[PDB]
Amino acid sequence: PSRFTKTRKHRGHVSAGKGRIGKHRKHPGGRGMAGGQHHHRINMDKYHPGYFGKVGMRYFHKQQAHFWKPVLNLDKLWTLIPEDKRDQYLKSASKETAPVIDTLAAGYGKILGKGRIPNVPVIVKARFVSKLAEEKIRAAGGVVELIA
């Protein structure tokens, strides 16, 4: 769609929309992030505070596989059950027949308690769990057991 551009509409107008006084020059302010402390400092301080300097401590050879730990909340905890058996599990809200959720094969590393699961007991297999999530599972009547 070169035909919908303003280059097509600027045909016949001298400056091509770039001005007669301050023309289109090559690099009137510098190239890239030039002068971010000198004449682009106002833009840096307004729109990107914290840009200059270093804060934290380094980590040589940091592998993100170590820190892989996707978080699953309790409101999404029941979506790990297939939709077919989900209704049966919700209706037959009994211990000693509780569904097993293995969040590790689901793809999650930690469980957080964002709240309001039903009162159906459930066996939750999680690598890590938060205090509130464990308390809410206990209140629902299920259990969270630690896996690896």
Binding site: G32, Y47, H66, A98, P99, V129, S130, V143, L146
Partner: protein, 193 residues
């Protein structure tokens, strides 16, 4: 220069990048060439399954710990437990990996079962026979798929005894963090009478 509220972008194009531009126009032609090569090699090895039988192994790190995938070749221990020598396994189409060890009984059983299945499901022609071909299949991988082992049943009984599984994690982390200091204290107390 720098301008209105925009992200800071790092476009690494300050070298002569236009000489090193590889636009993959040959994607379709190369897919055709790959299929042609696969077909030609199949015609060359006409009775053979076009690939070797690979074992089931576990993915290394903690992020892919859960998954089970296809390895390079079977351990010498695995092929021994299946009942073959390494050289004969290589010659009849079983990939053998010398450097991989099995510290794991579950994976050992899974791969020995794979080897037994392959032995049952293949036929080795004699060197001086009538060559009774059997409508060659083209993928040992497709006919011996890798299946994720089932870890647990769908429903079980709640076994709660009152440790909350968070106090357990906190305590285990604490003992890991402080074990050296505790050993220090024990050694100092033994040393100073």
């Amino acid at each position: 220069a720098i301008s209105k509220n925009l992200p800071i972008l790092k476009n690494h194009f300050r070298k002569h990048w236009q000489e090193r531009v590889k636009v993959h126009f040959d994607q379709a032609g190369k897919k055709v060439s790959r299929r042609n090569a696969r077909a030609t090699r199949a015609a060359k090895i006409a009775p053979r399954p076009l690939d070797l039988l690979r074992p089931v192994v576990r993915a290394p790190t903690v992020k892919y710990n859960r998954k089970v995938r296809a390895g390079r070749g079977f351990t010498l221990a695995e092929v021994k437990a299946a009942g073959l020598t390494a050289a004969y396994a290589r010659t009849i189409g079983i990939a053998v990996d010398h450097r991989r060890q099995n510290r794991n009984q579950e994976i050992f059983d899974a791969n020995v079962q794979r080897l037994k299945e392959y032995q049952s499901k293949i036929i080795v022609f004699p060197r001086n026979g009538k060559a009774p071909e059997a409508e060659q299949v083209l993928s040992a991988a497709a006919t011996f798929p890798i299946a994720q082992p089932a870890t647990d049943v769908e429903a079980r009984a709640v076994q709660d005894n009152g440790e909350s599984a968070f106090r357990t994690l906190r305590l285990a982390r604490s003992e890991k963090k402080f074990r050296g200091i505790r050993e220090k204290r024990a050694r100092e107390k033994a040393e100073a009478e």
